[PDB]
Design a protein around this ligand. Sequence first.
Ligand code: EB5
Length: 133
Amino acid sequence: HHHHHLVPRGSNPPPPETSNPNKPKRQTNQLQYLLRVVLKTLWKHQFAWPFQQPVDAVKLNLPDYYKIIKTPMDMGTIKKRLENNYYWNAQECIQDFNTMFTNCYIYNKPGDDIVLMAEALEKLFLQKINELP
Ligand SMILES: CCNS(=O)(=O)c1ccc2c3c(cccc13)C(=O)N2CC
């Protein structure tokens, strides 16, 4: 039989939403600081690039990524959420950062390059979080 299951193909999931008109939203001083200070300083770091967009499991050849990670998050998504005033409070934004870092540690092993990158960025994140208004 000549059906060899070379189709249908894999794919990346739809990325997390960055707009939601019926979601409650505010601008707070903490959320402005999270954009202006926390996100933008992390974004410029040389270890930021793996985290600047949703994981492209196809390009990166990580076909098990979304088998393991069911709540993906990345700083590109977070950056757009802050720019779109998506959040109600600082906690919602911070939980996105926590999710991103947690996904990295779940999927990978201690000592992997990606984990070392996440640890460094997390250490910085936590330092900047302590200067929150
Ligand atoms: C160390 C960078 N390696 S990569 O560009 O192949 C990559 C980018 C983003 C990743 C990963 C992950 C695992 C392994 C490699 C890798 C991963 O969890 N992410 C999202 C932070």
